[PDB]
Amino acid sequence: LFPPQWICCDIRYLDVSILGKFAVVMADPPWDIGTLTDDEMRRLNIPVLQDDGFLFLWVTGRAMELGRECLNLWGYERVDEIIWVKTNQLQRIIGHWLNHGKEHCLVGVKGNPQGFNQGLDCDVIVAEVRSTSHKPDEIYGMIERLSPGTRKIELFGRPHNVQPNWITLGNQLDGIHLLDPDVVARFKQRYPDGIISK
Ligand SMILES: CC(C)[C@@H]1N(Cc2ccc(C(=O)NC[C@]3(O)CCCN(c4cc(NCc5ccccc5)ncn4)C3)cc2)CC12CCC2
Numbered sequence: 001l002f003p004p005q006w007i008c009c010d011i012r013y014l015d016v017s018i019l020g021k022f023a024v025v026m027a028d029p030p031w032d033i034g035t036l037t038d039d040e041m042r043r044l045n046i047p048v049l050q051d052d053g054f055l056f057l058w059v060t061g062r063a064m065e066l067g068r069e070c071l072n073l074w075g076y077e078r079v080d081e082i083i084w085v086k087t088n089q090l091q092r093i094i095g096h097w098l099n100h101g102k103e104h105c106l107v108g109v110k111g112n113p114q115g116f117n118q119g120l121d122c123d124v125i126v127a128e129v130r131s132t133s134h135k136p137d138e139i140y141g142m143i144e145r146l147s148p149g150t151r152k153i154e155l156f157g158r159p160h161n162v163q164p165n166w167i168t169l170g171n172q173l174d175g176i177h178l179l180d181p182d183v184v185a186r187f188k189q190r191y192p193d194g195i196i197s198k
Contacts, residue, residue, distance in 0.1 A: 001179040004162035008173040009196050011155055012040055017048050018186035019167060023113070023150035024143050025049055026056040028135060030156060031063040034171065038066060046074040049153060052111030056082070056143065058135065059104050061095065067106055076108030084125040084136055094129055105139070120145045134160065151180075 007014065025046065030036060046055070055076050059067035071078055082105040086094045093101045120142075127136035140163050143152065154161055157168040167183070176194070178184050 001181070002164050003179060004164055004166060004168070004177070005179055005183070006157070006159075006162050006168040006170070006173045006177050008171060008175055009169055010171055011044065011169050012036065013198055014169065014196050015190055016045050016169075018190050019049065019153065019183060020151070020180075020186075021051055022049055022153045022167075023053040023116075023147045024056065024152040025053070025155070026139070026143070026152070026157075027155040028058040028133075028157070029063070029067075031060065031066065033061040033063060041066070041070050042073055044070075044074075044155075046070075050110050052113045053109075053150075054113060054116070054146070055106075055108040055110065056139070057106040057108065059106055064104060071106055071108045074108075074110075076110050078106050079109045080107035080123055081105070082107060082123050082125060082139070082142075084127060084139075086129045087126060089128055091126070103135075116147050117145060134158075140166075 027046075029041060031041070032038065055071065055074070057067050057071055068078060083102045084105070085102050088094055125136055125138050125142075127138050130136075144165070149165065152166045154166055154168045155170075157170045158172050159174065161170075162168045162173075167178075167180075176187075178187060
């Protein structure tokens with residue numbers, strides 16, 4: 001069901017098996033550099049979410065290495081790395097050895113995805129910093145062109161992240177808003193009283 005959908009939850013505890021399979025996963029984790037310990041990141045049930053497709057994993061500091069570890073543990077191979085060059089409104093550029101002009105997003109592949117439009121965008125994003133920790137909306141356009149019309153899931157998103165074709169998970173969203181019939185049914189079965197606990 002195309003319009004935006006979301007679930008307020010602790011991603012550590014939600015049974016993500018009810019959600020189905022997704023062509024694209026995006027995660028912007030609170031790396032321990034509401035944070036998650038390294039072991040909790042490792043233990044996230046990312047493997048059930050996809051059979052063939054792509055993972056986009058934002059990283060920084062030592063999560064550049066830790067994120068590669070999770071990516072590989074979850075069953076992915078890193079095949080690209082997007083950098084977002086942060087600018088102001090005049091298109092000028094906005095870790096203790098160098099000043100940081102960029103954020104990194106690892107791209108991992110699982111299985112053998114077919115029908116994706118690889119090569120349409122390049123791996124550099126130039127976009128204005130909106131707010132603190134707010135990723136650029138350009139990433140959704142790149143992902144939509146890469147995999148048009150397919151179903152997608154974002155982990156650790158905020159209300160401003162919700163998008164059509166996307167299911168957004170995060171503990172700062174407002175309630176549960178699910179419209180896909182298969183998802184609603186499996187959610188009701190797993191969560192008859194509408195509460196997520198362990
Ligand atoms: C360079 C990259 C890395 C950079 N990212 C940094 C970033 C900064 C903010 C957010 C963020 O604020 N997310 C909303 C939030 O709700 C916050 C609350 C925690 N989060 C949970 C946690 C949870 N369970 C465990 C748990 C453990 C203890 C207590 C509660 C829960 N389940 C669901 N959500 C998520 C996300 C990423 C932004 C970039 C991309 C551009 C720069």
